[PDB]
Amino acid sequence: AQESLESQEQRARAALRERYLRSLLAMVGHQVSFTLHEGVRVAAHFGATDLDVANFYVSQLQTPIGVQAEALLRCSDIISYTFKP
């Protein structure tokens, strides 16, 4: 029998999401390089995001005047992020 597409979609949503959370959890404590809007790059250690993925919580944020202990980066300012496991 054909399963409702709503059910199929929601199950695929759960699998995609679980994989995404796993990818973020593997990034905890690594240095990541953020590509920002306005052509800028910044580096920081990753701590967490919120579940809406609206903010990244980071530590050891590099700046021209020196390393900052903690910061919050808005995901709306970010284009991409990369790190090396």
Partner: protein, 86 residues
Amino acid sequence: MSEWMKKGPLEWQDYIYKEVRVTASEKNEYKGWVLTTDPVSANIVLVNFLEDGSMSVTGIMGHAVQTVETMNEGDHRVREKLMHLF
């Protein structure tokens, strides 16, 4: 809203383990293997096996995604490497 953010979860799911080229805001370009797409933000996660033998993981923010184009379907070997990840 953007084309990429409107895609069904079942469509996002078919990109997994395929090699893809992503064009994003401000002329940023990426190529890599799809690990997943976050259904909340539409962030796409790519794995790269780099020239020096190391491995990177890259997320491109869903709001910044412009186009996504499949380049390679993959094979059993790469699929197993990617499955063993995390």
